[PDB]
Swiss-Prot record:
Function text: Monomeric heme protein which primary function is to store oxygen and facilitate its diffusion within muscle tissues. Reversibly binds oxygen through a pentacoordinated heme iron and enables its timely and efficient release as needed during periods of heightened demand. Depending on the oxidative conditions of tissues and cells, and in addition to its ability to bind oxygen, it also has a nitrite reductase activity whereby it regulates the production of bioactive nitric oxide.
PROSITE patterns per record: GLOBIN
EC numbers for this chain: 1.7.-.-, 1.11.1.-
Identification of the protein by name: Myoglobin
Length: 153
């Protein structure tokens, strides 16, 4: 459980993401793909992009990042009361994309990295701790929904 003050820090930095959702989503994917190339495999639509500049020039990848971050933002804004938003996400990611929980850890790391790279003055230790707790809650709750659908994270 997050305190009200922790949620406020999460949403404070999230408003900064919302000033440029597409750019943040591009940076998060590029970091994710570089740190963990097997995650680029899971994105079988983008597996073929060879360089950072090709990745940045992909309109489809940019649009996909906005779709992803929009769903995450909608979840974060519910401050843990996110069953209705999380359930369809768990359904698609368990039964179609087949994204293990470890890959959600990988993208959580990339989110933290990009947020600290772009917003260090609004993303110090306490804000990082709050965002880490909110992403941990997200991963814990989606893992439980994964199991309800069969097959483990
Ligand atoms: C912050 C966590 C994530 C959120 C909120 C998220 C959200 C979404 C949303 C909203 C879609 C479109 C609708 C859907 O199919 O559910 C989507 C599609 C997808 N996501 Fe995620 N996602 C997350 C993490 C990941 C990770 C970690 C991977 C893979 C390593 C991943 C791989 C995919 C793929 C492969 C698709 C569909 C792409 C296509 O149509 O080609 N997602 N995601
Ligand atoms: Mn993605």
């Amino acid at each position: 459980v997050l305190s009200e003050g922790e949620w406020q820090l999460v949403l404070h930095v999230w408003a900064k993401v919302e000033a440029d959702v597409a750019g943040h989503g591009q940076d998060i994917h590029i970091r994710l793909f570089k740190s963990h190339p097997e995650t680029l495999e899971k994105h079988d639509r983008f597996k073929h992009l060879k360089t950072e500049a090709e990745m940045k020039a992909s309109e489809d990848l940019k649009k996909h990042g906005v779709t992803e971050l929009t769903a995450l933002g909608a979840i974060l804004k519910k401050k843990g009361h996110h069953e209705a938003e999380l359930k369809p996400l768990a359904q698609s990611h368990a039964t179609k994309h087949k994204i293990p929980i470890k890959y959600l850890e990988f993208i959580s790391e990339a989110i933290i990295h990009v947020l600290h790279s772009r917003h260090p003055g609004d993303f110090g230790a306490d804000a990082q701790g709050a965002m880490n707790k909110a992403l941990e809650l997200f991963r814990k709750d989606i893992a439980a929904k994964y199991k309800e659908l069969g097959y483990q994270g």
